[PDB]
Design an enzyme around this catalytic site. Structure first.
Site, short mmCIF file in Angstrom:
data_model
loop_
_atom_site.label_atom_id
_atom_site.label_comp_id
_atom_site.label_asym_id
_atom_site.label_seq_id
_atom_site.Cartn_x
_atom_site.Cartn_y
_atom_site.Cartn_z
CG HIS A 154 37.83 44.65 39.76
ND1 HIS A 154 36.60 44.50 40.49
CD2 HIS A 154 38.12 43.54 39.08
CE1 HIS A 154 36.39 43.33 40.22
NE2 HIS A 154 37.07 42.56 39.31
CE1 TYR A 162 46.79 40.12 35.54
CE2 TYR A 162 47.81 37.98 35.72
CZ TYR A 162 47.90 39.34 34.99
OH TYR A 162 48.89 39.67 34.10
CG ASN A 204 40.33 35.29 37.25
OD1 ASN A 204 41.60 35.38 37.29
ND2 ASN A 204 39.99 34.80 36.04
CG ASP A 248 35.70 46.27 43.23
OD1 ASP A 248 36.45 45.42 43.78
OD2 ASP A 248 35.32 46.15 41.93
CG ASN A 267 34.65 36.99 38.06
OD1 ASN A 267 33.61 36.44 38.37
ND2 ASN A 267 35.32 37.25 36.77
#
Length: 187
Positions: free
Chosen positions: A20, A66, A68, A93, A114
């Site tokens: 990610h 982060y 999201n 990704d 996300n």
């Protein structure tokens, strides 16, 4: 003509090698290549550099929000420098491409990602460019996507992903100059 290149990922040492974070890998390597130093910029909620790329001034960003919450970072920078979605490239990704594949695309929905979801929400637009770095999908190896992207690629995957990121770096001149068709042919 691209004025902001964003790489997506999660903050902290524990996440650095995870799938990610593929977008961070690309932006880290682009920064190094450009002689730019990424620095914590509280205004943009992430690591930031103003890079000189192939004669153009291009902002580089790795949100530290982060995954999201990546949109809080992107919109802070975009509004500050008056950058339009069409002038933004987001490296991320991509589950729907295999390891070793990389593609350039304008828009196209989030594909469940996300980070993309949050960026499109904060910009009120999906119409930004993406550098889709294939990581494959957990179904591929069978005769839980959330946990798949929180593991590093398998060694054989990493080798072909590294080469795909190199191919992407090599098309950046065309991207920053708005030469889309060239970039796609080369990619």
């Amino acid at each position: 003509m691209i004025k902001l290149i964003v790489g997506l990922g999660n903050p902290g040492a524990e996440y650095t090698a995870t799938r990610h974070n593929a977008g961070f890998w690309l932006v880290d390597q682009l920064a190094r290549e450009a002689g730019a130093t990424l620095r914590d910029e509280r205004r943009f909620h992430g690591f930031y550099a103003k890079a000189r790329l192939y004669g153009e001034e291009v902002h580089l960003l790795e949100p530290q929000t982060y995954m999201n919450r990546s949109g809080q970072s992107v919109v802070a920078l975009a509004h500050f420098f008056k950058i339009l979605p069409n002038e933004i490239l987001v490296a991320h990704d991509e589950l729907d491409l295999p390891p070793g594949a990389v593609k350039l695309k304008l828009g196209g929905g989030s594909g469940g990602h996300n980070g993309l979801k949050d960026i499109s929400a904060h910009l009120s637009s999906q119409q930004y460019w993406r550098l889709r770095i294939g990581i494959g999908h957990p179904r591929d190896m069978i005769p839980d996507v959330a946990n798949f992207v929180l593991k590093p690629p398998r060694k054989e995957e990493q080798d072909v992903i590294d080469a795909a990121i190199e191919r992407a770096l090599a098309v950046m001149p065309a991207v920053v100059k708005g030469e889309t068709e060239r970039a796609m042919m080369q990619l």
